[PDB]
TrEMBL record:
FAD 1 binds at residues 239, 252-255, 288, 359, 365, 390, 396, 401. It comes from Methanosarcina mazei (strain ATCC BAA-159 / DSM 3647 / Goe1 / Go1 / JCM 11833 / OCM 88). It catalyses: cyclobutadipyrimidine (in DNA) = 2 pyrimidine residues (in DNA). This is Deoxyribodipyrimidine photo-lyase. One of its GO terms (biological process) is UV protection.
Length: 448
């Protein structure tokens, strides 16, 4: 219960009501600081617990794959808080006017939410702050070290962020106190109408069969843990050597759960540190879930235009500007990129994995984004196309890891300058021939 995990969004006078947890990013009962700190606040005020979820009007911008993944985990979530005597109230509409109305109707005393450096959360936060009179608090329940505490300034590279983050690990890498149930307390239809409005935009093939295959990742808190145990037991030892081979499913497969907050990265880090495996593989994994994941929150928190060309490092901006006018080898529209109708079969195979499974392998996710920059009229058009394709079809999309990852591939964020080349400039280059010498491309293409 470190007080450094909490910050004040609006200082006011708490009323005689239940501490209302506005769950947005961490959709889990266990291992949730915001839920834990809300319970502590409610206990110190002799007040019950309150959990509120908002079903925003922005779910039409995504597919059924994300809607069903989040909604199915909500059903498991609701029965989980019921066992803890914690009622769950789910609202549909704008968070700005629905959270404010809820606080007035239920006479809530204190409002608490989880942290999200994305632009949408800030848009919702400003609306709620202007329509409430109760104190509003926010808890960083997604990062092992709080985003504002890891660093006070945007970090240029993982070389400069790793020593800072590991310094605060002994203070902040701790276990989760048990969630105390309430002493006393006072989706199927919603899901059905959501998919009915999302059916016309569902991805279909020539024979009109659905593209998405939903058996690859079962949503829910229970399934997220089971993926964690299987990764550690069977797929952690070989992670260091085979994490760059798409043909092998050596990855943890925890990104869809981590994005929706169905499992805490802290518990994953706690479990992998206790487990015994190859030291190189262990360090490679913590380098991904701790260093590169949390720098994404740092990148989005300290860069207002994190999804724009303005957030690129100056060496990349000058290099891309000097090679703006080079004649591109090929140009592809958004529709051509979407259907996978390019001249590169590796790119087409990666896009097919994205369309079918909803989760593209991390190694090819660097090839997939960089080739978009190669075959785009401008770097800005590459950013727009990559972001749209990422957020539309990825189960882990609309996440700070996505925008930091896209900026890494296109704008060189958290990278260094490489050999100068036409069109792409000094940005890191990955070729089809290069991938052939790293992994068997043929098996990847045939699979998808
Ligand atoms: C262009 C591009 C876009 C991306 N968009 C997303 C996205 O929308 N959502 C998303 O969750 N990930 C994104 N990633 C980051 C990364 O690719 C994924 O986290 C990772 O591939 C997911 O696979 P995994 O977690 O099952 O396996 P693992 O390799 O074991 O990843 C474990 C965890 O480490 C983190 N991680 C791994 N690689 C990275 C990385 N390059 N940057 C930041 N964190 C990382 C992830 O949080 C991940 O959960 C993107 C990467 C790129 C290159």
């Amino acid at each position: 219960m470190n007080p450094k995990r909490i910050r004040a969004l609006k200082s006011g006078k708490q009323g005689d009501g239940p501490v209302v947890y506005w769950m947005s990013r961490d959709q889990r009962a266990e291992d949730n600081w915001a839920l834990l700190f809300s319970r502590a606040i409610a206990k110190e005020a002799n007040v019950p617990v309150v959990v509120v979820f908002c079903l925003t009007d922005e779910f039409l911008e995504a597919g059924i794959r994300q809607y069903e993944f989040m909604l199915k985990g909500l059903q498991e979530l609701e029965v989980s808080l019921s066992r803890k005597k914690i009622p769950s109230f789910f609202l549909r509409g704008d968070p700005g006017e629905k959270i404010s109305r809820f606080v007035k109707d239920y006479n809530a005393g204190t409002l608490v939410t989880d942290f999200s450096p994305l632009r949408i959360k800030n848009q919702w936060i400003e609306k709620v702050i202007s329509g409430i009179s109760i104190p509003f608090f926010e808890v960083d329940a997604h990062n092992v070290v709080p985003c504002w505490e890891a660093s006070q300034k945007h970090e240029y590279a993982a070389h400069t962020f790793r020593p800072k983050l590991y310094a605060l690990l002994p203070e902040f890498l701790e276990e989760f106190p048990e969630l105390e149930p309430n002493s006393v307390t006072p989706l199927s239809d919603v899901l059905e109408t959501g998919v009915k409005a999302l059916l016309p935009e569902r991805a279909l093939l020539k024979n009109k069969d659905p593209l998405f295959e939903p058996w690859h990742f079962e949503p829910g808190e229970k399934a997220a843990k089971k993926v964690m145990e299987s990764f550690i037991a069977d797929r952690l030892d070989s992670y260091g050597a085979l994490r760059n081979d798409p043909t092998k499913n050596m990855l943890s497969n925890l990104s869809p759960y981590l994005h929706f907050g169905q499992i805490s990265s802290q518990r994953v880090v706690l479990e992998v540190e206790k487990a015994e495996s190859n030291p190189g593989s262990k360090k490679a994994f913590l380098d991904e879930i701790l260093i590169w994941k949390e720098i994404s929150d740092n990148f989005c928190y300290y860069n207002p235009g994190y999804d724009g060309f303005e957030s690129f490092p100056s060496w990349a901006k000058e290099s891309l500007n000097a090679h703006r006018n080079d004649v591109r080898s090929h140009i592809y529209t958004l529709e051509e990129f979407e259907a996978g109708k390019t001249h590169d079969p590796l790119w087409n195979a990666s896009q097919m994995e994205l369309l079918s499974t909803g989760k593209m392998h991390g190694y090819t996710r660097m090839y997939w984004a960089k080739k978009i920059l190669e075959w785009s009229e401008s770097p800005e058009k590459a950013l727009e196309i990559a972001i749209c394709l990422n957020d539309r079809y990825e189960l882990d999309g609309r996440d700070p890891n996505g925008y930091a990852g896209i900026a890494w591939s296109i704008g060189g964020v958290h990278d260094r300058a490489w050999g100068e080349r036409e069109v792409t400039g000094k940005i890191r280059y990955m070729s089809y021939e290069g991938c052939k010498r790293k992994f068997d491309v043929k098996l990847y293409i045939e699979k998808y």
